[model samples]
Target: RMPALFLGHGPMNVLEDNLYTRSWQKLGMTLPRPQAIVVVSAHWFTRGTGVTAMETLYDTHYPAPGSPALAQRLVELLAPIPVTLDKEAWGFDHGSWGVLIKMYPDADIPMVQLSIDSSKPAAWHFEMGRKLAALRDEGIMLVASGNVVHNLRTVKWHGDSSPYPWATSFNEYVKANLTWQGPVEQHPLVNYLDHEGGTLSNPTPEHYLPLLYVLGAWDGQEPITIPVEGIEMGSLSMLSVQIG
Candidate 1:
């Protein structure tokens, strides 16, 4: 059985704070233990698509010795794959590890971080997500962590007031669209900003594009939306969705 997920992982600061991050902790308890986690995070972006495939469970040692010698191996396997014996500095970004820390506090489950090709188009991201969709059945939880309505420019650094009307409106709009029973693929509404409301919600595409990947990987099943709504820095929407 495959269990798909789209998580709302907040900024790195959430790691030290307990109050706001408790939701992720609760989410861990609510979900089944995954054999491994394949995370696509907003923090790390590369020029081209790269898959993190390691020989062992550790991220340090990827290329196992006595294996097929290939120059152009996956990013994770390009260098000597980390093993229990290997020591290294390379590791998960806050975007990926932060949530994992709360969810699997023990850090027992193996993790792989795949870098998003920033240069790639939204369609490419969607297709890449589709290609990796099979990982769900393999007990690898697919997590695309990014806000649907993220506008760093409008962030409030001080007090937390009600979210910007635009943020709330956009968040709700995307949520409704995602949960709608209509054919998402065929529907232009599913595409970004086709509707007047969408354009207003997502002025920029980076943050919103990950939602497309999640939507593309969806098997047309009704998704349960778990909203982590709040004003992070005053203006930035911390609203996140989980479609399972």
Candidate 2:
């Protein structure tokens, strides 16, 4: 089975040579390549859940082919959820392409981007991941891209900017719960707001929601690896979780 990943994809790193990008490249080289990739990107938030059926483009950087069959499969798998096939409505935004370009730079793999339904709660998104987990058995790598602690409002522009105390604390808390010896539903990530600095860390839920999808798909028995970890720009987390 292909491993599911929660990539801490930040803005403006796809074109740059950075630690996160380096780690992504190593992952691509080591991990078995998937037949197709399914992405749950933070950028594609919509009123309802959707999946891309057209090729994903990123300003000449990534022109990955689309998988209509995969999109249909997702829709069928997620019955009663009414996942729409987004043929022309949307394509991959920065959240998907930023990390994909770093990892699969060749862009040869077929991809289908899934939209986060903004109307739903965290539990709903987690359930969606559970329903989609079966795709891993079919050689489809499920990737959810977004930062864990993303409070853009408080981001510092400098490269050497130190991580905020709140961001560090919150990130550690999230990491612990991700590897906790308990049911995923019981983890604090589902109702993240209850934790200390959770509100400040996540000024908005879009970035943090992607992690929940990956966690939901994870089997509790598998080893969870942190290929990369850091807090960027004071509020964004460069924490990538890989679950086998």
Candidate 3:
């Protein structure tokens, strides 16, 4: 089965050389290559869910093929849930290409991008992940690109600035819950805002919500791994989680 991953895509990471970028490169080189990839990008939030079903051109400069067939398959797999066919409505955003430019630089693999439905609830997104899990059996890697702690309002201009205390606390909270092997309903992440720093860590839901998809897709048989962990620019989280 292909791994399901939750990767943080800091807005400008693709254009810079840094620890996070290097980790993404390592992940691309080391992980078992998949037949195709499906990305749920935070930047693609819409009133309704949709998936890309057309060939792609790189506005971000990472040219790659899009799999319309696979997109249709995804729509089928997510039956009972309405997923629109997005041939022209969308393409890869910075949330995806920023990370993929490092992960799969060759741009050889066929990829698809899924939109996050702004109208849905958090649990609904997780259920969508569970529905998405079937794709792993067919060698499709599910990558959710967003930050766990994504508060742009508090960003520090300097790259080397220390992470705010709340950022570390929140990231650790997420890491602990992910590794704890507990029921999803009881997970702190599911009720993110009730916890301290949760509101500050994620002022909005788009960035944080992607991880729920990855979490919902987990098979409950594999150990979770944190391949990359850090807080940069005082507010952004560079955490990446994987399950094989």
Candidate 4:
């Protein structure tokens, strides 16, 4: 099975410049190539669930299907969904394409982006992820890109100071709590909003809840590994978990 990742995507400025972002760009290169990629980005939050199923071709305009005609019963249909390719119009957003530009610089891989349903609860996202679990065996890598401890209001704007004590404390607390022996489904930290100090870091669960999606899709009942850990700008924690 392919490993799942929850990346802590930082500021939009990271798309154009930033050393820390460069590190993430490098990390993407080390992974095995996949048939296709489906990304869930924090930037594309929607009120309800919607999937972009533009099956024909990416950027194009084609003739619509026509109704049957009179006597002879004539029928009209668009063939192969005319590929009206546009060079500059359609492509990945900064969140997906930015890292992708460095990872697959050639743009050789096929990619699809998914929008997060901001209105949904944490449990709903987790269940949604579970439904897509079979993609792992189909050579599709599911990546959730968002910060675990993202508190923009509390962010330090000017300097590169270490993460605030609260950010560090909460991050560590979450790491430790995930491993508790109780029923995996019952873990309070899973719905992090219910956990203590949850609201402080995750004022809204849009970004933080993506992690629960990864956790719900985990095949084994083992504890997840926080292979990458660090904090940025004293507000966002670059702590990501990898699940099998």
Predicted candidate 3 versus true structure: per-residue lDDT over 110-170, tens digit per residue: 8888899999878788888889899999989998989999888899977668999999999
Task: Assess each prediction's global lDDT (C-alpha) against the native.
Answer: 0.58, 0.82, 0.83, 0.61
Against the true structure, what is each candidate's TM-score?
A: 0.73, 0.93, 0.92, 0.74
lDDT of 2 by residue, 152-241 (tens): 788897866899999999998899788654654566888788888888988778988988888888877888899998887888788999
Kindly state the number of residue pairs that clash in model 4: 0
The digit string of per-residue lDDT tens for model 1 on 59-141 reads: 32222121111112223332342212112223555555666677667766565556667776666666665556666666766
Task: RMSD for all candidates, in order, please.
Answer: 6.8, 2.1, 2.2, 9.6
**Candidate 1: worst 10 consecutive residues by lDDT?**
63-72
Best by lDDT: 3
| Off by more than 4 A, model 2 | 14-16, 55-61, 181-185
Q: In candidate 4, which residue ranges exceed 4 Å CA deviation?
A: 11-23, 53-96, 178-185, 221-223
lDDT of 2: 0.82
Model 3: how far is 173 from its true place, Å? Answer: 0.8
